Structure 1
Amino acid sequence: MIQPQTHLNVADNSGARELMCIRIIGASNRRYARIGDVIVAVIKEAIPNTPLERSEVIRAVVVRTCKELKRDNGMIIRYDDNAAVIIDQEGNPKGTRIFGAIARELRQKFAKIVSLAPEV
């Protein structure tokens, strides 16, 4: 449930701290987004002396949402924050390491992120 002007955290080693979604990708003329959906984002806080600057436009995918993610077996997932991970056109992350747990639903689209995660 990621609307534009939504402040997201960063999970990877990309060297950023905060993001701000401005558009959604993949969903035609949609305004919200769940985990696994790609977004366009704007950096607002970055780490000093890193390849990423403060006001760059990038692509990223949502990995954590405070909104609840329903499964088929009745299980539901909930996080206590909103976060994302930057990506390239192929979909691989720039950061070498990942923080936070990832859901198993991302293996069908983003398997590299599932491997680098500490837990699932």
Structure 2
Amino acid sequence: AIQKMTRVRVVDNSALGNSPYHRAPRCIHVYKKNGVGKVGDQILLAIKGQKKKALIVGHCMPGPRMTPRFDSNNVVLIEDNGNPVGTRIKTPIPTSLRKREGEYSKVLAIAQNFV
């Protein structure tokens, strides 16, 4: 569960995510009617003094049984149009995204590992 003002780990090849900064990227907003964000939920970050859209790919909070649980809250940066900012995802990505409603094909394509 990712809410407003949740510190977040960017799992991406993108320069914006990986570049050193004094503060960790923080969730500005969750694009869901309830504030709570899960896997496949688009969020808005404060990263490097700019507002940027991101997609959640795993989190610490437990979910359904067979679904994986990650030790860190993991996001992938996306532009307003919907394409990913970064080229590659090294961190393993759950396969539950495929069936979920939304634009997940781009992210799965650039992903290398699935858990």
> Partner residue of 2:36?
32
Q: How does 1:38-57 map to 2 (within 5 A)?
A: 38-43=42-47, 54-57=48-51
Gaps of at least 5 residues in structure 1 are: 44-53
| Inter-partner Cα distance in structure 2 for 1:82 and 1:63 | 8
Alignment RMSD (CA, Å): 1.5
| Aligned counterparts of 2:93 and 2:58: Cα–Cα separation in 1 | 8
Percent of aligned pairs with the same residue? 32
Which has the larger strand fraction?
1
Query: Counterparts of 1:76 and 1:98 in 2: how far apart (Å)?
Result: 19
Larger Rg over CA atoms: 1
Is the alpha carbon distance of 1:24 and 1:93 closer, same or farther for their aligned partners in structure 2, counting shifts above 3 Å? same
Measured after TM superposition, the shift of residue 100 of structure 1 is 0.7
Superposition TM-score, scaled by structure 2 size: 0.82
| Native 8 Å contact 2:11 2:75 kept in 1 | yes
TM-score, normalization by structure 1: 0.79
Between the aligned partners of 2:93 and 2:29, the Cα distance in structure 1 is 23
Which residues of structure 2 form unaligned runs of 5+? Answer: 19-23
- Size of the aligned set, in residue pairs, is 105
Would you identify which runs of 4 or more consecutive aligned residues in structure 1 move more than 3 Å? Answer: none
Matched ranges for 1:64-83 at <5 A: 64-70=58-64, 74-83=65-74
